[PDB]
């Protein structure tokens, strides 16, 4: 697997191997999605906002 | 800098998002909005808060008894007033820095020269023929064209910004995006083996839109809940004829769709008006990639989908 995590800011980041994937990202508080469901392919990352 | 200290105080929280230069571009822009029903009201409010130079609100119709009893820009009991005039005082008061004007003439009757005074043109509640006509006009004069509508739980936005250049923070990178005529957008050939493949991944809202534009064409009005049974049957017939005519199964759009596409729902106006107004703001200030070219919202499922359709 040569995977990509895309963030809301369109931040494209390549990865290859709850897990460790997240652990690299969490260092750069988030939630991880694969084509719909929670966790050459794409992982979408979503952050919860606290403004209102 | 190029703005007053009162404006800077007022606009502070959006200057910190999109920059003073973006704001200055807003401050120089004038927008035509046609149709002051639920969605127009939302777009109007958002553009005026943002602080365009001018907004002209064009509606030739009156407030009717069928229209909602609460409308945030119109006082209660204005049945029979022109809908633009009925919106002016509340709209203007949202932001005195904006030159908010009203026009009461039918958009169809407007000469091509009426348009040239605007940086962007946004059409709600307009017929297919008018959408194509004004989009052609805007292309000639390089005016940002937009249209949108809401119907029950659904709505859509469309943009034609021609060849559109903008900055986007990767520092700012300059980029270019190319849009197509609305006529092409609304008249896709589903024959191509390519298109057959695109169809499997195209939201059915696009076909919903074709059905409702045809209803609007045939009836001079949109479906109304007062006439639910009458309008339901006709919508079902229009679904058959529209999809049969495009070589698609009628069943792509399910037969109960009629339950979900009547009337203006205030929350659906808020959603579609927020997306549409923000695309207008992006276009005028030349910051961030705009959606190319349709946004389809389904308030039942909570989906908002950008489709590129036409080429």
């Amino acid at each position: 697997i040569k995977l990509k995590v895309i963030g809301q800011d369109s931040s494209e980041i390549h990865f290859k191997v709850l897990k460790k994937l997240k652990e690299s990202y969490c260092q750069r508080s988030l939630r991880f999605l694969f084509e719909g469901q929670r966790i050459e392919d794409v992982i979408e990352v979503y952050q919860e906002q606290t403004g209102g | 800098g190029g703005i007053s200290e009162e404006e800077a105080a007022q606009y502070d929280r959006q200057i910190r998002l999109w920059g003073l230069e973006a704001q200055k571009r807003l401050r120089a822009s004038r927008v035509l909005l046609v149709g002051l029903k639920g969605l127009g009201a939302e777009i109007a409010k958002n553009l005026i808060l943002a602080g365009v130079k001018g907004l002209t609100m064009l509606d030739h119709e009156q407030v009717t008894p069928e229209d909602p009893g609460a409308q945030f820009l119109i006082r209660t009991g204005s049945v029979g007033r022109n809908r633009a005039e009925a919106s002016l005082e509340r709209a203007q008061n949202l932001n005195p820095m904006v030159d908010v004007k009203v026009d009461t003439e039918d958009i169809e009757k407007k000469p091509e020269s009426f348009f040239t005074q605007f940086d962007a043109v946004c059409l709600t509640c307009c017929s297919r023929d008018v959408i194509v006509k004004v989009d052609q006009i805007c292309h000639k004069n390089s005016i940002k064209f937009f249209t949108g509508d809401v119907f029950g739980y659904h709505g859509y936005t469309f943009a034609n910004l021609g060849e559109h250049e903008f900055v986007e923070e990767k520092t700012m990178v300059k980029k270019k995006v190319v849009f197509c005529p609305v006529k092409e957008a609304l008249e896709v050939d589903w024959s191509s083996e390519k298109a057959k493949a695109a169809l499997k991944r195209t939201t059915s809202d696009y076909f919903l839109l074709q059905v409702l534009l045809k209803f609007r064409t045939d009836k001079g009005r949109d479906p109304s809940s007062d006439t639910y049974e009458e309008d339901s049957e006709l919508l079902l017939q229009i679904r058959n004829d529209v999809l049969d005519s495009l070589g698609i199964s009628p069943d792509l759009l399910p037969e109960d769709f009629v339950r979900y596409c009547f009337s203006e729902m205030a929350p659906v106006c808020a959603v579609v008006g927020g997306i549409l107004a923000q695309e207008i703001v992006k276009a005028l200030s030349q910051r961030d990639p705009p959606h190319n070219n349709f946004f389809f919202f389904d308030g039942m499922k909570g989906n908002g989908i950008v489709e590129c359709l036409g080429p």
Partner: protein, 490 residues
């Protein structure tokens, strides 16, 4: 307009909106236009000019008045028949209790911080009332549904600060100088706190209100002690400056002898030193009429922090920053616009209609993106997750474990920095399981350690908040190996 049952529900029951700001104003409009005929609206703030770019029920003439009050009056101008009750007040206030919450068929948050969100979460669990939660920031936002016994609660999932050393002795970023300036403002005018010390730290591993009162708060004296004296005593501690660039002390007299918006320009050293003068004079005067609390919008306080931090930046060879920039950072300002809030408020009502229609199964968490995801989705709906059974809030008989030094941690530190801050209780009653430690009203003479109470590695405390109808059992672990004053044991 709506299915009869839904319409009846909407016309029938009463709903609660918490917050009348960006999301709240939009949401109030949407609820009324949608037919909600009984709305209570609570917000504790008054209207500020910077609100006016997105809080559309408020005009300039309303500056200084209550948000909730003006919100209601603005709505009644386009729909006189609305029934709205407006509270100028905090949801955190004990009057808003479980029976108050029980009135509502739907609660909707329109808040801008976690603590109030936590409190409301607990209230809605206690009252068994569905809660729609949401937030926004910039171009982004989301909405979700919370229902007791069906979904995660707000705190089911895990949701920073800098060491005294980096702030007192070893700053490397403008933010250290900014935090320092903030500490310096509290220490001078606000609430003295040990955690907010400004004088160089004499006990560093890499190696105040009294003093200012006795000078009658003299600009030139403070300046000299802070920008000259203190950088000298820091230059004593020679180990630090073997690796990193030394700080250069500032002489008051030497200093005096040396486009975007107004606020976006970085001034010279002399100007911030003068602005340090001016603001200190203004603050000393208005400290006599009205302990002061820091607010980003108080001109003089903002000026104070701006100048202090920029002087400290200069001293440590960093480029100085515009007041505009220091405002973001010291204020923690969230950029905010009309459209994002309008889209989120629109979604909130849609979720709400699904709930009261008995179609919660169809409710979703919905993220608003800036740009379509790969499946082309600009709004991304997701399944609601079930309760986490190990949630310290919504699970049956919750418990957690805290590791702290039992001998060197106050009863004040527990009431404050732990049960209140970390665990977001408001009206907590704590009792050692075996001896009432903290009380609702009373036990004001306990603040002065825990050790001297029977508390040791393995003692148990029962924390209540009878307002939140919440009971948390806290298991204690002793240790003296902590960095840091405590850790939530994970």
């Amino acid at each position: 307009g709506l299915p009869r049952e839904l319409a009846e529900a909407v016309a029938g029951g009463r709903v609660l909106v918490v917050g009348a700001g960006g999301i709240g104003c939009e949401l109030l409009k949407n609820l009324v236009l949608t037919g909600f005929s009984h709305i209570d609206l609570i917000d504790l703030d008054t209207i500020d000019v910077s609100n006016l770019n997105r809080q559309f029920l408020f005009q300039k003439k309303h500056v200084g008045r209550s948000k909730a009050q003006v919100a209601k009056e603005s709505v009644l101008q386009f729909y006189p028949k609305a029934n709205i009750v407006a509270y100028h007040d905090s949801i955190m206030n004990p009057d808003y209790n479980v029976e108050f919450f029980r009135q509502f068929i739907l609660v909707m948050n329109a808040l801008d911080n976690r603590a109030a969100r936590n409190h409301v979460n607990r209230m809605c669990l206690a009252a068994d009332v569905p809660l729609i939660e949401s937030g926004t920031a910039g171009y982004l936002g989301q909405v979700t549904t919370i229902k007791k016994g069906v979904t995660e609660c707000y705190e089911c999932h895990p949701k920073r600060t800098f060491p005294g050393c980096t702030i007192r002795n070893t700053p490397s970023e403008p933010i250290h100088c900014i935090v320092w300036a903030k500490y310096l403002f509290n220490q001078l005018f606000g609430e003295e706190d040990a955690d907010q010390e400004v004088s160089p730290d004499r006990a560093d591993p890499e190696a105040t209100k009294e003093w200012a009162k006795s000078t009658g708060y003299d600009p030139v004296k403070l300046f000299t002690k802070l920008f000259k004296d203190d950088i000298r005593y820091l230059l004593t501690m020679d180990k630090l400056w073997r690796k990193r660039k030394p700080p250069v002390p500032l002489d008051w007299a030497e200093v005096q002898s040396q486009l975007g918006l107004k606020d976006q320009q970085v001034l010279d050293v002399k100007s911030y030193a003068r602005l340090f003068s001016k603001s200190i004079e203004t603050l000393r005067v208005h400290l006599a009429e009205k302990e002061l609390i820091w607010d980003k919008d108080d001109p003089s306080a903002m000026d104070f922090v701006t100048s202090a931090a920029n002087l400290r930046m200069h001293i440590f060879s960093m480029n100085m920053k515009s007041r505009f920039d220091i405002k973001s950072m010291a204020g923690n300002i969230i950029p905010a616009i009309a459209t994002t809030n309008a889209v989120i408020a629109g979604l909130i009502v849609l979720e709400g209609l699904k709930i009261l229609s008995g179609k919660i199964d169809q409710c979703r968490t919905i993220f608003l993106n800036k740009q379509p995801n790969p499946r082309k989705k600009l709004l991304v709906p997701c399944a609601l997750d079930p309760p986490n059974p190990n949630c310290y809030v919504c699970a049956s008989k919750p418990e957690v474990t805290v590791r702290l030094n039992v001998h060197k941690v106050t009863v004040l530190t527990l009431q404050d920095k732990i049960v209140k801050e970390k665990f977001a209780m408001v009206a907590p009653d704590v009792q050692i399981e075996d001896t009432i430690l903290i009380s609702s009203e009373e036990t004001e003479a306990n603040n002065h350690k825990l050790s001297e109470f029977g508390i040791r590695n393995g003692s148990r405390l029962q924390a209540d908040d009878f307002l939140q109808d919440y009971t948390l059992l806290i298991n204690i672990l002793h240790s003296e190996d902590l960095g840091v004053e405590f850790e939530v044991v994970g």
